[PDB]
Design an enzyme around this catalytic site. Sequence first.
Site, short mmCIF file in Angstrom:
data_model
loop_
_atom_site.label_atom_id
_atom_site.label_comp_id
_atom_site.label_asym_id
_atom_site.label_seq_id
_atom_site.Cartn_x
_atom_site.Cartn_y
_atom_site.Cartn_z
N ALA A 170 35.19 43.85 33.02
CA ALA A 170 36.35 42.98 33.16
C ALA A 170 37.50 43.41 32.25
O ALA A 170 37.31 43.59 31.04
CB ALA A 170 35.97 41.52 32.85
N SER B 278 38.85 53.92 29.48
CA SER B 278 40.00 54.42 30.22
C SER B 278 40.24 55.86 29.81
O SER B 278 39.96 56.26 28.67
CB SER B 278 41.25 53.57 29.95
OG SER B 278 42.45 54.21 30.37
N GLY C 169 34.47 47.26 39.56
CA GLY C 169 33.32 46.38 39.42
C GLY C 169 32.67 46.06 40.75
O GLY C 169 31.44 46.04 40.86
N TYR D 238 47.10 48.27 25.83
CA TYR D 238 45.97 48.69 26.65
C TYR D 238 45.21 49.85 26.00
O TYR D 238 43.98 49.80 25.90
CB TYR D 238 46.43 49.08 28.04
CG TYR D 238 45.30 49.51 28.94
CD1 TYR D 238 44.51 48.57 29.61
CD2 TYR D 238 45.02 50.86 29.12
CE1 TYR D 238 43.47 48.97 30.45
CE2 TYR D 238 43.98 51.28 29.95
CZ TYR D 238 43.21 50.33 30.61
OH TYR D 238 42.21 50.77 31.42
N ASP E 193 34.83 33.50 32.56
CA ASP E 193 35.96 34.01 31.79
C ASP E 193 35.36 34.64 30.53
O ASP E 193 34.78 33.94 29.69
CB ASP E 193 36.91 32.86 31.47
CG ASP E 193 38.07 33.24 30.54
OD1 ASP E 193 37.87 34.02 29.58
OD2 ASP E 193 39.20 32.74 30.77
N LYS F 57 41.20 49.85 24.53
CA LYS F 57 40.17 50.76 25.04
C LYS F 57 39.62 51.66 23.94
O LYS F 57 38.43 52.00 23.94
CB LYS F 57 40.74 51.58 26.19
CG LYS F 57 41.09 50.78 27.40
CD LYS F 57 39.91 49.90 27.80
CE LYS F 57 40.10 49.36 29.21
NZ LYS F 57 38.91 48.66 29.72
N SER G 236 36.43 42.78 42.20
CA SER G 236 37.33 43.71 42.86
C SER G 236 37.26 45.09 42.21
O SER G 236 36.89 45.24 41.04
CB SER G 236 38.77 43.19 42.84
OG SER G 236 39.24 43.12 41.52
N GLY G 237 37.70 46.07 42.98
CA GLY G 237 37.83 47.42 42.47
C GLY G 237 36.55 48.02 41.95
O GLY G 237 35.49 47.95 42.59
N1 LIG Z 1 42.17 51.27 38.21
C1 LIG Z 1 42.55 52.32 37.23
O1 LIG Z 1 43.39 53.13 37.50
C2 LIG Z 1 41.85 52.36 35.82
C3 LIG Z 1 41.99 53.44 34.98
C4 LIG Z 1 41.36 53.44 33.75
C5 LIG Z 1 40.59 52.33 33.37
N2 LIG Z 1 40.47 51.24 34.20
C6 LIG Z 1 39.64 50.04 33.78
O2 LIG Z 1 38.84 49.63 34.70
C7 LIG Z 1 38.52 48.09 34.32
C8 LIG Z 1 38.27 47.26 35.58
O3 LIG Z 1 39.50 46.94 36.19
P1 LIG Z 1 39.79 47.54 37.69
O4 LIG Z 1 40.45 48.93 37.60
O5 LIG Z 1 38.49 47.64 38.46
O6 LIG Z 1 40.90 46.51 38.49
P2 LIG Z 1 40.58 45.04 39.17
O7 LIG Z 1 41.72 44.11 38.81
O8 LIG Z 1 40.44 45.18 40.66
O9 LIG Z 1 39.14 44.48 38.54
C9 LIG Z 1 39.17 43.87 37.25
C10 LIG Z 1 38.34 42.55 37.37
O10 LIG Z 1 38.27 41.81 35.94
C11 LIG Z 1 38.50 40.53 36.20
N3 LIG Z 1 39.11 39.85 35.07
C12 LIG Z 1 40.30 39.74 34.48
N4 LIG Z 1 40.13 38.89 33.43
C13 LIG Z 1 38.83 38.50 33.39
C14 LIG Z 1 38.13 37.64 32.52
N5 LIG Z 1 38.55 36.84 31.32
N6 LIG Z 1 36.82 37.42 32.73
C15 LIG Z 1 36.17 38.04 33.79
N7 LIG Z 1 36.85 38.87 34.63
C16 LIG Z 1 38.19 39.09 34.42
C17 LIG Z 1 39.47 40.57 37.38
O11 LIG Z 1 39.40 39.43 38.13
C18 LIG Z 1 38.94 41.77 38.22
O12 LIG Z 1 37.99 41.28 39.28
C19 LIG Z 1 39.55 47.61 33.63
O13 LIG Z 1 39.07 47.06 32.28
C20 LIG Z 1 40.50 48.76 33.42
O14 LIG Z 1 40.92 48.78 32.09
C21 LIG Z 1 41.09 51.25 35.44
#
Ligand SMILES: NC(=O)c1ccc[n+]([C@@H]2O[C@H](COP(=O)([O-])OP(=O)(O)OC[C@H]3O[C@@H](n4cnc5c(N)ncnc54)[C@H](O)[C@@H]3O)[C@@H](O)[C@H]2O)c1
Lengths: 247, 259, 252, 247
Positions: free
Chosen positions: B87, B139, B18, B152, B59, B156, B15-16
């Site tokens: 992740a 982040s 990734g 968090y 995981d 990071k 999702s997102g």
């Molecule tokens: N969306 C924002 O605003 C933002 C801002 C700064 C940084 N980030 C970073 O972006 C990274 C990705 O998250 P995202 O924003 O795409 O949201 P998201 O929840 O849509 O995607 C994160 C994915 O990691 C997976 N996940 C959680 N635990 C896991 C594990 N043990 N093993 C494998 N996968 C696991 C989730 O299922 C998910 O598919 C995150 O690490 C987050 O810290 C996001």
Amino acid sequence: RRLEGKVAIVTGGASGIGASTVRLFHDHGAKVVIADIQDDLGQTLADRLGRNISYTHCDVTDEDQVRALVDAAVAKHGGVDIMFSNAGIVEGPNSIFDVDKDELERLMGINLVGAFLAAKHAARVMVPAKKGCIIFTASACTEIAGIAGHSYTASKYGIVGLMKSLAVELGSHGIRANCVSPFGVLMFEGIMSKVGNLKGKILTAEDVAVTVLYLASEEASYVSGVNLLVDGGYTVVNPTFINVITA
Amino acid sequence: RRLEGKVAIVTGGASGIGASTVRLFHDHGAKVVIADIQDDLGQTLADRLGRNISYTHCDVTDEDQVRALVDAAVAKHGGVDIMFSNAGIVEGPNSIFDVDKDELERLMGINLVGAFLAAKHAARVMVPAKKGCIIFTASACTEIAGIAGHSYTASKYGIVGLMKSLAVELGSHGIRANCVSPFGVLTGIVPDDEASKLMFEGIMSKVGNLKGKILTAEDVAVTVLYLASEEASYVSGVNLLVDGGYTVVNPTFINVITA
Amino acid sequence: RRLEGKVAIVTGGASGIGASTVRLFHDHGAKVVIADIQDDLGQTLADRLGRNISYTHCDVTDEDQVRALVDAAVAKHGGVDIMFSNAGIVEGPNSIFDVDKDELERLMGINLVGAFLAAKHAARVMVPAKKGCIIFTASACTEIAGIAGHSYTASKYGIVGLMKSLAVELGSHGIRANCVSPFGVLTGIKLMFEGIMSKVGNLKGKILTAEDVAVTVLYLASEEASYVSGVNLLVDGGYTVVNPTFINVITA
Amino acid sequence: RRLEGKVAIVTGGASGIGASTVRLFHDHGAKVVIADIQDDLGQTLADRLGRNISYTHCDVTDEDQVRALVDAAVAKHGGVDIMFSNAGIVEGPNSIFDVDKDELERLMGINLVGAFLAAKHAARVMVPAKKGCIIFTASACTEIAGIAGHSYTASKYGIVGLMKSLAVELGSHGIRANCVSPFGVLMFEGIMSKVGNLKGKILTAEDVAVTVLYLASEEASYVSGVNLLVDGGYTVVNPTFINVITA
Ligand SMILES: NC(=O)c1ccc[n+]([C@@H]2O[C@H](COP(=O)([O-])OP(=O)(O)OC[C@H]3O[C@@H](n4cnc5c(N)ncnc54)[C@H](O)[C@@H]3O)[C@@H](O)[C@H]2O)c1
Ligand SMILES: [Cl-]
Ligand SMILES: [Cl-]
């Protein structure tokens, strides 16, 4: 394809990184105004690349040549999308006792005042368009010592500060400001292959040019305020300790 | 295109950010294995995306699952060119009084320990190949406070330290390591309500320094493509922020004096 | 006597940097609670220094022990002025293939999880008093690679991030939070080690000891730094600012 | 009394932070040369403080005056232990359209060129002594935008770069180089109390002086290369986001 219809000015663009950036900008469909003070190199390249590449003599230390350079670009092409403020002079590592006040003020004029002026007048015409991108050439010396002279590093630090102050100000108008801080360009490659942290690859002018392309393309539409190093990790390590105990 | 013939593993790719990177890496001709723990989302996307896209449940806190993720990917495709260690779980701004030692150790396990493992076994197979690129998702909070929770932000920051030490170590083998620091992308953080989406993006446009464009997952995907592309052949050790300059300004002073 | 009437807790304070800071804080008139798990060393220092130095055994991994450490300091002394979160374990430069998930989680618990707890409960009593200073021990490895291991490097980076968000949160209550980042490999290091000092240290002619790092913590904790918060102050003689490879290959 | 027997030159030392550091240096037993271009303020101050505080007029943009400032100081006292390069001029937050090439070059001469010269001649006489400390006054604007003008911000970035390369070079001679980056010292307190991150306390010149004292003291004998912020955490936060989501 990526810069189609965009108008870019590249100061210091008759040779080296600026020329590599001019050719690559030309390959991606941008109209490029080559600006330099080497008139034969600049005119020869602008003609060889074709109809969308012109040349304009511009010593960046003369605000009137600079104001005219941008004004000729808007008249000829409708506006300025990209300003690659690359014009500068380079000195390698030296000592504080080698710094001459007149050499120092000269370098500061080309490197720091030149970037100031090129930004002011690029901003002058970009702000009304509510579009625009400004990219300065700093140096890897902005994040580690021992790879440039005192006057050079301080001028490039000042560009980074200017870049961040422009990113905040021009951010309200949808305008980005960024740096690219390359490492080693000007037997010589053998010395570079020995000092680089990322082994195998040598840094070339197009390598820096494709990074300017990224920062200037719509692909970096939300990248601003950034001093993007292209150093293969040279500036993040001091290997002295590891060398004394592992080598 | 730019990634043709390259093999990329994308943790968190269901999702997102990734997932956007998986699609973009796919469009540019890479073989991409989605690694995640949302099995319905992950498997359905890899099958709809097509032939060059596989799925592998992993995981990231389980080193055995991580070691297996890369080993089966090496078996399927010959090697791993790109490791996008993405992740993670996110915390918004909170107080040091809200940190529970368990929620913290959980957050650290996914975000930081997962980052270590995903890198450790990516290096295991990359080092002999003398080729490879590892990209972590950090982040924007790695360069400014006031936009994320304590656990968090601390995870990071640790990812960034890891990235820089890997940049030095794996640099001897022609292997690059970099971070991306995005700033509020509409993602699996925010629920699926169109309301909950328009409000997240609208406030992001208010708080954002660079006005006139919204930051999305695809925008972050194109930077990861850049960092993993050979177009960044000499970029290593860099935590490239994608924030439109949010982390370079504290506008409090100017705001107080426009009264 | 810069710390008159001030009460400081120093975790990991039975030895090394923590012990030097306990002694110096004692010399500057502070009531100091030594917190550590080396009870032989820890109790001996608190008794030998005198009346204003007590000892409290505390594993920073155990939130109940740390909650008691702060609660006992409040009981004996009225409140907490300074919390020096110094407890940690160290790794030198290594390879990511040397990282064991269990050793990684152990280091993270002492270095990072412990720092969180010591901050949570130091903040607990500092906030109602509307004053207080929390100082963490990071590492010079937070600004350069090659002088600590991967797990250690990442834990100390995390302390830096934790410190900055506490600086923002606790700033609203008049509370300062800062780090000190020594050049740990070079602190208090025979003619083998003296040769290594000249080669690896940037600021030649001088040597870094535990006492030196203690006085930077004293500066950071005293009223001399009344407006210093958010800072990761390196005590490294400038090591982290140079990569001397380039000039070395061209001077030979 | 930490500075006993040490000799300090303080440029810009007739007023503000420089004067605060002069008085504090005086109280800690240092011989101080007040260096400034406000001659009435500077001479009156050096006389009031006593034997160990003398005055020397010095425009830092004039290398001959600066070369003389150090040489007359070494002649009077035996050497220079501390060089507090504090002389500078300030610009508030502005626009890149307000920067005038001549004001830009004027500020650059005082802020950055003065820093090079003041360090060069401090380095000239410190290196043979195999001891010495140089402290520049940078600014909180070196770590965040929105609190100073473009020309000023770039000059202060340049000081930081100068300091870092001096820390590497002069470190081989046992000589330290550091910066201090203060925030709001040059109706007013209410604005500072509501823009500051660390609430309840206000920053004064006396506060910055004691941080300079720390950096110049032997208590900091192994601190070099550092740009120490005295901002109460102002440069580490952009509170825009949390403001919009709390009420
Ligand atoms: N969306 C924002 O605003 C933002 C801002 C700064 C940084 N980030 C970073 O972006 C990274 C990705 O998250 P995202 O924003 O795409 O949201 P998201 O929840 O849509 O995607 C994160 C994915 O990691 C997976 N996940 C959680 N635990 C896991 C594990 N043990 N093993 C494998 N996968 C696991 C989730 O299922 C998910 O598919 C995150 O690490 C987050 O810290 C996001
Ligand atoms: Cl699912
Ligand atoms: Cl910042």
